[PDB]
Amino acid sequence: GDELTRSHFNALYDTLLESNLCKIIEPFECVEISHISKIIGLDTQQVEGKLSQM
C-alpha cells in the first residue's frame, strides 16, 4: 500500500541486490558463480547479467 512505497521499494530491491553482490564478493579473488548464486539465492543467468551490469 501507499503506492509510492512499493514503486520505490522496487529500486530499493535492485540497490540491495547490488550491495549484497558487493558484500559477498569482498572476501574473494576467484569466487565461483555457483557458490555466489547459492549464497544470494538467485539464478546463474540472472546473477551473471547483474554482475556484468555492475
Binding site: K23, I24, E26, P27, F28, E29, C30, V31, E32, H35
Partner: protein, 436 residues
C-alpha cells in the same frame, strides 16, 4: 520573623487546658488548637506554631483520625500566611508517626501518602520530605508488585537537582530508581538515569559502599546489553577500591570476573592494553586458572578449541555472572568466536598461503563456517584475506606498494648508517681500553 506578642508562655499555659479537653473527642480540642494556630499565624511566630502543629497532629494520630488528619493537613497547607517552616515540621511529624503507625492498614497509608505528596507538590522547603515520602510509597507499591506504576512514580522525581538533600541520599535515590528501571525492563532508561551521577562524587571515603552498588548496577546493565569491555572497565574500577582490594576473599571473585570478561571481549587496542596491565598484576599470580587463561589469550600461538573447552571449562562453569548457568550459554558461543578470531589473528600474522583444508584443521570450523568467519572478519576490517576457492588457497599477505618497499629500503639504509657510526665510535673506545 518576630511575633512581638510571643505566645510560648501562653502556649504552655493553654496546653494543659487542651489536654484536659483531650480526655474525650477532640472536636472542641482541635477547634481551640486551630484558634491558637490562627493566633500564632497572625503573630507569625514559628516556635509556637512548631509545638501547636506537633500537638494537633499527635492528637489526631492518637485517635487514629488520619481520615481527618489528611483534610486538616490540606487545610493548614492551604492556610494563608502559614509559615513554611511550620508546614515542614508538621509534615515531618506526620512521616515520623507513620513509621510508628503499626496498626495502620494499606488504605490508610496510601491515603496519607497521597495527601502528603499532593500537599507538598511543587515546593522547595519540603523537597527532601516529599522525596522520602515518595520512596516509602514506592517501597509499598513494589512490595505488592505493580512494578510499572512504582517505577514511573519513582522515575518522575529528578533527584540530581533537589539541592536541599545531602550527598548521601541523592545517590541512594538514583540507585533505587535505576534498580526499579532494571526491574521494569527498560535498560536504556536505566542507563539514562546512570549518567546523572558524576564519578568525582565517588572519590570520597564515605561513599565507598555506594560506589560498589552503583558500579555493580552498571555492570548488570552492560552485561545485559553485552558491552563486555565496558563491564571489564567497571569491574576494574570496583577492584581498585580499597574495601575489596584489601580483602583477598573479595577481590579474588572480582579479579576472576575481570579476567573472564576481558577475555570475552573482542580485540582492540584497549583490550590489549588492559590484558597486558592485568597480566602485570601481582595479585593475579595467586590465581592459577585465570593466570593460565590470560597466558592462553596473550601468546602468539594457536590453541585447540576442544583443549580449552575441556580444560578450563570446569573452573569457568563453577561461577556466577559469566559461564555460570543456563542463562550463561550466551557466553560460551562468544568464547568460541573469540578463540577462533585469535587463531585467525595469529595465522594471518604468521602464514601467507594457508590452504583451506589445513585452515579448517587449525580453526576446527567444519567446512563453511570457516569461509563465513573469514568473510565477516575481513568485512569488519581486522584482517587482510583473499580466498581462491577453485584453488582452495588463502592469500593472507598484503601486496606491498612501491612506496612501502622504498620506505623499508630507506629505513634499512638508515639503520645501516647508524650502526656503522656506532661501530666506528666503539672501536676507538675499546682501542683506548685495551691499548692501555
Amino acid at each position: 520573623i518576630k511575633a512581638d506578642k510571643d505566645y510560648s508562655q501562653i502556649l504552655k499555659e493553654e496546653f494543659p487546658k487542651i489536654d484536659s479537653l483531650a480526655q474525650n473527642d477532640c472536636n472542641s480540642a482541635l477547634d481551640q488548637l486551630l484558634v491558637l494556630e490562627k493566633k500564632t499565624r497572625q503573630a507569625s511566630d514559628l516556635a509556637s506554631s512548631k509545638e501547636v502543629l506537633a500537638k494537633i497532629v499527635d492528637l489526631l494520630a492518637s485517635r487514629n483520625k488520619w481520615d481527618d488528619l489528611n483534610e486538616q493537613l490540606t487545610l493548614l497547607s492551604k492556610k494563608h500566611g502559614q509559615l513554611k517552616l511550620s508546614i515542614q515540621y508538621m509534615i515531618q511529624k506526620v512521616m515520623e508517626y507513620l513509621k510508628s503507625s503499626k496498626s495502620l492498614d494499606l488504605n490508610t497509608r496510601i491515603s496519607v501518602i497521597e495527601t502528603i505528596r499532593v500537599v507538598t507538590e511543587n515546593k522547595i522547603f519540603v523537597e527532601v520530605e516529599r522525596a522520602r515520602v515518595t520512596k516509602d510509597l514506592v517501597e509499598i507499591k513494589k512490595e505488592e508488585g505493580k512494578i510499572d506504576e512504582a517505577a514511573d512514580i519513582l522515575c518522575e522525581l529528578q533527584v540530581e537537582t533537589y539541592g536541599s538533600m545531602e550527598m548521601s541520599e541523592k545517590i541512594q535515590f538514583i540507585l533505587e530508581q535505576m534498580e526499579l528501571s532494571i526491574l521494569k525492563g527498560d535498560y536504556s532508561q536505566a542507563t539514562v538515569l546512570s549518567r546523572k551521577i558524576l564519578k568525582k562524587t565517588f572519590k570520597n571515603p564515605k561513599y565507598e559502599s555506594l560506589k560498589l552498588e552503583y558500579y555493580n548496577l552498571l555492570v548488570k546493565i552492560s552485561l545485559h546489553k553485552r558491552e563486555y569491555l565496558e563491564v571489564a572497565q567497571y569491574l576494574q574500577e570496583i577492584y581498585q577500591t580499597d574495601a575489596i582490594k584489601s580483602d583477598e576473599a573479595k577481590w579474588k571473585p572480582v579479579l576472576s570476573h575481570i579476567v573472564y570478561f576481558l577475555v570475552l571481549s573482542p580485540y582492540g587496542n584497549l583490550q590489549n592494553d588492559l590484558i597486558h596491565k592485568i597480566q602485570n598484576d601481582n595479585n593475579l599470580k595467586k590465581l592459577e586458572s585465570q593466570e593460565s587463561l590470560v597466558k592462553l589469550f596473550t601468546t602468539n600461538e594457536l590453541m585447540r578449541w576442544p583443549i580449552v573447552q575441556k580444560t578450563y571449562e570446569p573452573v569457568l562453569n563453577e561461577d556466577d555472572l559469566a559461564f555460570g548457568g543456563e542463562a550463561n550459554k550466551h557466553h560460551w558461543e562468544d568464547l568460541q568466536k573469540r578463540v577462533i578470531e585469535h587463531n585467525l589473528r595469529v595465522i594471518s600474522e604468521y602464514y601467507s598461503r594457508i590452504t583451506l583444508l589445513r585452515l579448517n584443521e587449525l580453526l576446527d570450523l567444519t567446512e563453511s563456517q570457516t569461509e563465513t568467519y573469514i568473510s565477516d572478519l575481513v568485512n569488519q576490517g581486522i584482517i587482510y584475506a583473499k580466498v581462491n576457492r577453485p584453488a582452495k588457497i588463502v592469500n593472507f599477505e598484503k601486496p606491498k606498494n612501491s612506496s612501502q618497499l622504498l620506505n623499508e629500503w630507506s629505513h634499512n639504509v638508515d639503520e645501516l648508517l647508524e650502526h656503522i657510526e656506532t661501530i666506528g665510535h666503539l672501536i676507538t673506545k675499546e682501542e683506548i681500553m685495551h691499548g692501555l
